[PDB]
Ligand binder design. Structure first.
Ligand SMILES: CCCCCCCCCCCCCCCCCC(=O)OC[C@H](COP(=O)([O-])OCC(O)COP(=O)([O-])OC[C@@H](COC(=O)CCCCCCCCCCCCCCCCC)OC(=O)CCCCCCCCCCCCCCCCC)OC(=O)CCCCCCCCCCCCCCCCC
Ligand SMILES: CCCCCCCCCCCCCCCCCC(=O)OC[C@H](COP(=O)([O-])OCC(O)COP(=O)([O-])OC[C@@H](COC(=O)CCCCCCCCCCCCCCCCC)OC(=O)CCCCCCCCCCCCCCCCC)OC(=O)CCCCCCCCCCCCCCCCC
Ligand SMILES: COC1=C(OC)C(=O)C(C/C=C(\C)CC/C=C(\C)CC/C=C(/C)CC/C=C(/C)CC/C=C(\C)CC/C=C(\C)CC/C=C(\C)CC/C=C(\C)CC/C=C(\C)CCC=C(C)C)=C(C)C1=O
Ligand SMILES: CCCCCCCCCCCCCCCCCC(=O)OC[C@H](COP(=O)(O)OCCN)OC(=O)CCCCCCCCCCCCCCCCC
Lengths: 98, 99, 46, 175, 347, 83, 171, 96, 115, 318
């Protein structure tokens, strides 16, 4: 388990940490969401290439197919929250507190 | 599978990629083909409870082949001890490992 | 903490349309050179 | 120096990863992702994954383009932030750089790191395997079998993406 | 939303959940979750109220985070095992990552502050679909992987759910909010028995599905969303709220109503496993769930509440909608105790 | 005929691109089943020796398997030369 | 957990054939037909034993038979072969498509001077059979003892004793 | 014209591959000797490099199985020169 | 090696041209030469406020469609299989849904740019 | 001998765009009955040098509202991307023999648009943000057709290697088998490089700038030399992909002469259409691709997946 595995695993942790610390931006939040996807794609690519799991080389592709699909969903949701509330800071949508 | 429709309906949907020793395209074997082949042939129909205790060394060889955890650890010790021994000056690499 | 709306719809918030407004001249080569053409646009449709 | 570019490339991947995870302005976040995405493509290329490397390059670039194409569309701040700007982003940024630089120091000075899992520093060139590939690249034939061995995956992926266009319009339509 | 698109949108949700319960490959399980999330977000914001947008939004970030963590935990399992099959997880960190990865989809432990107001903002129709159907998929994954589960973590997940769910419901007026906390309370009950006997949580799931279904389409018929709005239904529809008493009592587990069958049968199973202190605990803290059930029962028809004169022509008109299996759902949700040994059909 | 011919002519006037694209899109699916060279394409792909033809041990009673590559028995693909 | 029986360095001291890749690429078809027997035997050892450490000698026979093939070609058609492989070597991809004329000189040379016929298309790709006298390895993978099967499920089914036997349910 | 030329290219590729199959036995035969030679050289040097260590019995198979596992490239070239490492691991990938 | 040397040379060449761009021509500047250009008269204050365009729907479908082209990219190596019937059926299947998604996107306003 | 090779590519490339600006006006003028530059040197053979030297000695200035860092890096992005993209082009023998050369050029060409809006966004100008937002959706929508057109044509290649086009169209030009795809390929190349049936990226008539909004002597020179280099290649890529040429392995000079001639003829056509058509409005150029190019694009794709199968002409993978 060489150091490149450490780099991208520790990377995904900061993607997890980055997502879980929304400061003032939904768009920057979605950035960290797609950020997670890099490390998962990159680690998955390293795994099935190292192990010569040739039939499983499709798995990183199918990750990406369902990757941007969420990415489109996030921005489409971001379209209306910014459209009808003006901005994208995740603090002005607290009307559901009650 | 929770509700195994693949077994009942008698078709394959994902039981072709779940393992490394399946029919890969153009018979390209995986790295640890033999190691997992023995492991699966070891614990087949024996149950997960019995598999985790009986087919244990076969899994350990297979898991090691996947990561080379101990083998790389062995190589790490060879290089580190060689480095300090060469640096101190006891012995020098033989000419075959120079060119 | 105020009660939730009865129809489950809050009143629309403050209007958020800015409607970017610029002057299309007079430096613009296609604005005949002497037009201070100012337009209001719905984002891209004037 | 050319000992093994895997760590160096992955380091820039993490530093670029640190960037947009610190919550900059969204446009600067795209740059922070792109450098990580570009160098991430470099990591996979170095490992033999030639097709997959350029694959994530092309898709992501288009993906993140519409990302920060959107940010300047309706998510822009009238006074945009920057890497320095607010102390929060400054604090979030410098925290990431000092963090990763601590782990790599913790990584390269004993080579027996045991955080969560085990990580021993001996060189990612080692895990490579000796053997030819005939007259075909293994990765290309693996992802080519999607139309022969993965007919089930094609159906679910195709249907989901088709539904993906339905939801996008349905969500964004409104009224 | 046009009717035809709505149907296909629903079918995608059912297909996404069905993919989870039939696939043996971890990637496909993740795909089934992804399709489930993707087809559901439009369903929540069907009416396009301002509330639904962030209600659907809070759904998205929570479950996307859960899906991404689930993908990561899968990847480590592949790294240390080279397997995609749903048998067990050969890295303890991989398992200890999926429990929360699946938990936020279920909403059990402090990964639950999304459940209340996502139920509140969205309509009652999708609220029913959210709290009943969206739990078969994550629970089905848990049932399959039930072997290699850390009992200390999984039990704490459920114990926290019962305590918070019961405690939170005591301070809710909006009927949807109380249902969410009550659902969270039942979340712990099903998941507490998960390590011991997976047959039991299936039984509790089936009973809870009938409880939440029958309760909700009674709320749909009453066309009420707050406790006060429900109160007036005694003037118009006395039988609906009178039936709502028995379902509320059953939902609280007050026997011999059908709602006792899970709470009873579960307690019997864990005492077989020398677990005694914990079963006594949820027996105690199920009572706070019962409290706001009775308060709902008191406010609905156990005590007739002040009415509104605008109800005359309301009595002049009958419902045109046609809830089906409602007469059936009440029967299973109230009186199936004599057929308790039928749990062996699941086994 | 009258309903169809009027529709095709009208579409051929207003939106020539769509009626065009639907044409080649239509032909792209139905000829490949009809055409007889599809089996040849399978045979050409099958006949390509990416891997080694690993020898199989001769315990006798294998008349069809050749003992030498130049032996007459075995899969002969002279049809490729003619084709 | 054991030892690794690496063979003696002496065993890895056989004649090492020395021709450039273009030389082998030029010989190709003629080499394959007139040197198949030692080639097939060695690889069958490779596939059966799954251990080159058990198949060095079969590798040696390949080198010796390869030498004789190349020893004959110098003795008879050294010049046209030297002309041919040089023409292959110039190309960056080593294609037979560009050196048909030199090939025409080469094959006719070995045909009327060494009795060699170029194998037809696909002939070299056929599956061959050999009569190696080594025994078939009983355990090529060195598999350990297979686990005993779990107690087989059998017997006749009769009504459950005293019904469900759960609490007050007599039946 | 494209149809005929592509068929000819397919015939050429068959000839190309058939040429490759002919020399595979030699390349396999020599490479196994080189790999065994490299491992043997590593083992002798490992014995010399560790003789005063507490317990490093020469050449213990980490895998419990007695069959041969396709060796790591690391354990082959590990103590060899830096140029040997780069030309071996990132040789084909970097050759552009 | 070869690829990174080429990448390095290009960025050094580009950066050197910047360096001689901003240093060889000396500067005599003031606060009015740095003013933003607005075709003469004073800007009203813009260029960072939300400038909402209309092709957002088709901008995001490009991202969906760009994933289709990723899925059908491996086709050149997919044709080199022994079961082209299944490969042909699946290859056309992805194209059909890609066409179907565009067609349904077309019919419901879709490509039309909001006013 | 690799630094010499690289500098034997960079210098000729920058000199090619250098005098393309002279063969622009001297061709544009002659097509509009003018004469073009013929004063600076004989026949204008020194005008671009006079243009270039001025554009590295007249005062550069960052905008007062600029973002310095992104303002400076965008010219770096444009120029380095343009140069690095010529790398796998298979002039007889390509400089870098990439196995996936086609995918490489697609990826980096999709990156040359980050320069245009990073310049636009950092410039903090109303015309800058408009031009930046015009260009991005312009290129990516034109990119969907770019990817599929390349795939459909390359299905007869059997691989993405650029060298194999020499072998593929050895006897017959590729355009004779894919001319319908050739037309949309040429139009898309006109659109990715922003020439002038769709030069709306600059939009000089309606946006005065947008390629380089406040960009000055140095940075303006880059954003020009980074897109005129793309002009020469996108026709070199068209030439290599569709109009093949005889390539004797012993005398590559004949192929280089032929290859250069096709690029020169194609480049003239880029200049030729530039002064023969009006400007597409934004919705029109988007409507042309999303509503007329794409339906034909997918249809001809399905044709080219099936075509080798029905005719048993699957090209060799190697
Ligand atoms: C336990 C096992 C049994 C489960 C039984 C489920 C019982 C459901 C009772 C519904 C009774 C009718 C009533 O008063 O309905 C209210 C309510 C609809 O409210 P409404 O205001 O009457 O709707 C007006 C229409 O939208 C007006 O139409 P529109 O113009 O809005 O167009 C949309 C319309 C279009 O409808 C159609 O085209 C038909 O959509 C529907 O009608 C919804 C259903 C669509 C078809 C679903 C087919 C599923 C198979 O029903 C639902 O919301 C149904 C949700 C989806 C199905 C149930 C999912 C929950 C169960 C999951 C767990 C299953 C067991 C797991 C173990
Ligand atoms: C990722 C790493 C990001 C590092 C960072 O803080 O970037 C800030 C950098 C500059 O932000 P800005 O909004 O242009 O504000 C610059 C001045 O604060 C505002 O403009 P200024 O006129 O003050 O600019 C001059 C200023 C800032 O220095 C510069 O403008 C020089 C170039 C940037 C240096 C940083 O010089 C100094 O502060 C003294 C330097 C000694 O923003 C970036 O996006 C650059 C990231 C570069 C990453 C590596 C690319 C290869
Ligand atoms: C609407 O539509 C529109 C368009 O179109 C659609 C348009 O077109 C246009 C454009 C308008 C017109 C065409 C109208 C007329 C206008 C013009 C012609 C403007 C002209 C503009 C120009 C920029 C002039 C261009 C002309 C010339 C002659 C350019 C010539 C080029 C040069 C002088 C430079 C050439 C390159 C050189 C010298 C490179 C030298 C390199 C080296 C010495 C080596 C460098 C590298 C190394 C040393 C590498 C080694 C170093 C290492 C390793 C360092 C390591 C370091 C470490 C720290 C490690 C507009 C406006 C438009 O509105
Ligand atoms: C135990 C079940 C009852 C628990 C207590 C319920 C509340 C107390 C009872 C009075 C409720 C108020 C009321 O109006 O009751 C009468 C109501 C029907 O009223 P009405 O429409 O006049 O009846 C016409 C009949 N031809 O009819 C009803 O309220 C019917 C109550 C049925 C309760 C569920 C029974 C399930 C099966 C056992």
């Amino acid at each position: 388990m060489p150091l490149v595995y450490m780099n991208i695993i520790m990377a995904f942790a900061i993607a997890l940490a980055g997502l879980l610390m929304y400061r003032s931006h939904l768009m920057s939040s979605l950035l960290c969401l797609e950020g997670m996807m890099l490390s998962l794609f990159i680690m998955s690519t390293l795994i099935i290439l190292n192990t010569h799991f040739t039939l499983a080389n499709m798995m990183p592709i199918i990750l990406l197919v369902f990757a941007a699909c969420e990415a489109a969903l996030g921005l489409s949701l971001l379209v209306m929250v910014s459209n009808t509330y003006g901005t994208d800071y995740v603090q002005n949508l607290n009307l559901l507190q009650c | 599978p929770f509700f195994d429709v693949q077994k009942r309906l008698g078709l394959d949907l994902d039981r072709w990629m779940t393992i490394q020793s399946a029919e890969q395209p153009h018979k390209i074997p995986g790295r640890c083909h033999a190691f997992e082949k023995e492991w699966i042939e070891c614990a087949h129909g024996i149950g997960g409870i019995r598999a985790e205790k009986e087919c244990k060394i076969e899994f350990d060889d297979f898991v090691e082949c996947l990561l080379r955890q101990k083998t790389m650890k062995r190589l790490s010790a060879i290089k580190r001890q060689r480095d300090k021994l060469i640096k101190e000056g006891k012995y020098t690499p033989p000419p075959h490992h120079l060119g | 903490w105020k009660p939730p709306p009865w129809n489950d719809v809050d009143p629309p918030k403050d209007t958020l349309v800015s409607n970017l407004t610029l002057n299309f001249g007079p430096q613009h080569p296609a604005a005949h050179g002497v037009l201070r053409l100012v337009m209001e646009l719905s984002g891209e449709m004037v | 120096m050319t000992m093994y570019i895997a760590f160096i490339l992955s380091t820039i991947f993490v530093i670029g990863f640190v960037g947009f995870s610190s919550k900059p302005s969204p446009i600067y976040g795209g740059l922070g992702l792109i450098v990580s995405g570009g160098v991430g493509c470099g990591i996979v290329l170095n490992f033999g994954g030639s097709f997959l490397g350029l694959m994530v390059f092309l898709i992501y670039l288009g993906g993140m383009l519409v990302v920060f194409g959107y940010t300047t569309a309706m998510a822009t701040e009238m006074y945009p932030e920057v890497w320095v700007s607010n102390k929060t982003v400054f604090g979030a940024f410098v925290s990431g750089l000092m963090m990763e630089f601590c782990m790599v120091y913790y990584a390269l000075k004993e080579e027996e790191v045991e955080i969560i899992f085990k990580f021993n520093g001996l060189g990612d060139w080692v895990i490579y395997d000796t053997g030819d590939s005939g007259f075909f690249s293994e990765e290309a034939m693996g992802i080519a079998a999607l139309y022969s061995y993965g007919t089930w995956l094609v159906i679910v992926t195709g249907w989901s993406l088709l539904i993906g266009v339905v939801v996008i319009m349905e969500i964004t339509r409104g009224n | 939303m046009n009717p035809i698109i709505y149907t296909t949108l629903i079918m995608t949700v059912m297909s996404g959940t069905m993919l989870v319960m039939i696939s043996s490959h971890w990637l496909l399980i993740w795909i089934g979750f992804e399709m489930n999330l993707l087809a559901m977000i439009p369903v929540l914001m069907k009416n396009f109220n301002p509330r639904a947008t962030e209600a659907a939004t809070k759904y998205f970030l929570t479950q996307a985070t859960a899906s991404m963590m689930l993908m990561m935990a899968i990847i480590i399992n592949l790294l240390y095992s080279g397997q995609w099959t749903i048998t067990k997880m050969f890295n303890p960190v991989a398992m200890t990552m999926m429990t929360m990865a699946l938990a936020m989809k279920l909403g059990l432990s402090p990964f639950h502050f999304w459940v209340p107001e996502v139920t509140q903002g969205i309509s009652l129709q999708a609220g029913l679909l959210l709290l009943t159907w969206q739990k078969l998929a994550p629970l089905s994954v848990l049932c399959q992987i039930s072997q290699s589960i850390n009992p200390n973590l999984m039990l704490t997940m459920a114990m926290l759910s019962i305590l918070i769910g019961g405690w939170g419901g005591l301070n809710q007026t909006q009927l949807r909010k109380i249902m969410a906390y009550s659902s969270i309370a039942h979340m712990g009950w099903m998941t507490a028995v998960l390590p011991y006997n997976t047959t039991m949580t299936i039984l509790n799931l089936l009973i809870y599905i009938t409880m939440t279904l029958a309760m909700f389409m009674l709320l749909i018929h009453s066309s009420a969303t707050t406790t006060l709005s429900l109160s007036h239904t005694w003037n118009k529809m006395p039988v609906i709220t009178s039936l709502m008493m028995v379902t509320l009592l059953s939902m609280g587990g007050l026997p011999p109503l059908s709602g006792f069958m899970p709470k009873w049968m579960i307690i019997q199973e864990m005492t077989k496993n020398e677990s005694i202190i914990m079963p006594t605990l949820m027996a105690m803290t199920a009572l706070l769930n019962l409290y706001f059930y009775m308060r709902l029962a008191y406010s609905s028809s156990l005590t007739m509440f002040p009415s509104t004169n605008n109800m005359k022509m309301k009595w002049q008109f009958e419902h045109t909608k046609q809830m089906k299996l409602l007469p059936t759902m009440i029967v299973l949700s109230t009186l199936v105790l004599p057929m308790t040994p039928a749990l062996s059909s699941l086994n | 005929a009258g309903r169809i011919a009027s529709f095709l002519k009208n579409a051929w006037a207003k939106e020539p691109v769509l009626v065009a694209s639907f044409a080649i899109g239509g032909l792209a699916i139905i000829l490949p089943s009809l055409s007889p060279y599809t089996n040849y394409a399978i045979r050409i792909n099958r006949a390509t020796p990416y891997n080694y033809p690993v020898p199989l041990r001769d315990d006798g009673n294998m008349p069809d398997v050749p003992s030498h590559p130049q032996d007459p028995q075995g899969p002969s693909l002279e049809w490729l030369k003619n084709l | 957990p054991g030892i690794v029986e690496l063979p003696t360095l002496e065993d890895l001291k056989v004649q090492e054939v020395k021709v450039s890749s273009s030389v082998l690429k030029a010989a190709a078809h003629h080499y394959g037909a007139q040197c198949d027997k030692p080639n097939k035997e060695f690889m069958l050892c490779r596939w059966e034993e799954k251990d080159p450490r058990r198949c060095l000698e079969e590798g040696k026979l390949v080198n010796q038979c390869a030498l004789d093939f190349f020893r004959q070609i110098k003795r008879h058609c050294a010049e046209p072969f030297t002309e041919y492989w040089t023409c292959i070597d110039y190309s960056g991809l080593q294609l037979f498509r560009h050196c048909r004329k030199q090939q025409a000189k080469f094959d006719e040379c070995v045909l009327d001077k060494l009795g060699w016929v170029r194998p037809d298309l696909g002939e070299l790709s056929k599956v061959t059979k050999v009569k190696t006298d080594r025994p078939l390895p009983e355990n090529p993978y060195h598999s350990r003892a297979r686990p005993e099967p779990n107690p087989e499920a059998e017997g006749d089914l009769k009504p459950a004793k005293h019904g469900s036997r759960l609490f007050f349910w007599t039946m | 014209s494209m149809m005929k030329w592509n068929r000819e290219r397919r015939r050429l590729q068959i000839e190309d591959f058939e040429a490759r199959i002919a020399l595979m036995p030699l390349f396999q035969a020599e490479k196994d000797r080189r790999v065994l030679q490299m491992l043997r050289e590593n083992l002798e040097e490992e014995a010399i490099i560790m003789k005063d260590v507490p317990d490093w019995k020469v050449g213990e198979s980490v895998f419990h199985t007695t069959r041969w596992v396709t060796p790591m490239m690391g354990e082959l070239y590990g103590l060899r020169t830096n140029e040997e490492i780069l030309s071996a691991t990132y040789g084909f990938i970097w050759y552009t | 090696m070869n690829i990174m040397l080429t990448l390095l040379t290009n960025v050094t060449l580009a950066s050197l041209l910047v360096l001689i761009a901003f240093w060889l021509p000396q500067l005599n500047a003031y606060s009015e030469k740095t003013s933003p250009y607005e075709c003469g008269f004073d800007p009203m204050g813009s260029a960072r406020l939300p400038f909402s365009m209309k092709f957002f729907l088709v901008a995001i479908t490009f991202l969906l469609f760009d994933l289709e082209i990723a899925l059908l990219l491996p086709l050149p190596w997919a044709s080199q299989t022994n079961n082209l019937k299944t490969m042909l059926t699946m290859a056309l299947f992805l194209l059909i849904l890609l066409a179907a998604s565009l067609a349904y996107e077309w019919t419901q306003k879709g490509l039309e740019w909001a006013e | 001998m690799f630094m010499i090779n690289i500098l034997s590519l960079i210098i000729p490339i920058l000199l090619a765009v250098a005098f393309l600006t002279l063969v622009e006006r001297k061709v544009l003028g002659y097509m509009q009955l003018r004469k073009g530059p013929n004063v600076v040197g004989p026949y204008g053979l020194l005008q671009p040098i006079a243009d270039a030297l001025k554009l590295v000695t007249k005062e550069p200035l960052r905008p007062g509202t600029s973002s310095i860092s992104m303002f400076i890096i965008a010219p770096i992005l444009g120029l380095s991307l343009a140069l690095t993209m010529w790398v796998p082009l298979p002039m007889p023998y390509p400089l870098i023999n990439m196995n996936l050369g086609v995918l490489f050029m697609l990826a980096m060409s999709s990156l040359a648009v980050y320069s245009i809006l990073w310049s636009g966004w950092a410039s903090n100008s109303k015309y800058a943000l408009i031009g930046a937002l015009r260009a991005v959706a312009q290129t990516i929508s034109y990119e969907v057709t770019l990817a599929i057109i390349l795939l459909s044509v390359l299905l007869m290649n059997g691989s993405y290697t650029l060298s194999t086009l020499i072998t593929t169209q050895e006897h017959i030009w590729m355009i004779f088998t894919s001319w319908p795809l050739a037309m949309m390929w040429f139009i898309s190349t006109l659109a990715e490089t922003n020439r002038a049936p769709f030069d709306l990226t600059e939009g000089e008539s309606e946006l005065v700038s947008g390629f380089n909004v406040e960009y000055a002597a140095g940075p303006f020179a880059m954003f020009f030399m980074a897109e005129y280099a793309n002009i020469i290649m996108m026709n070199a890529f068209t030439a290599i992909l569709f109009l093949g040429a005889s390539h004797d392995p012993h005398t590559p000079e004949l192929y280089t002469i032929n290859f250069v001639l096709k690029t020169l003829a194609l480049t003239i056509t880029f200049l030729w259409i530039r002064a023969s058509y009006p400007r597409f409005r934004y919705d029109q150029l988007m409507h042309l691709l999303w509503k007329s190019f794409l339906p034909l694009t997918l249809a001809l794709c399905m044709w080219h997946i099936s075509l080798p199968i029905m005719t048993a002409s699957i090209p060799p993978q190697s």
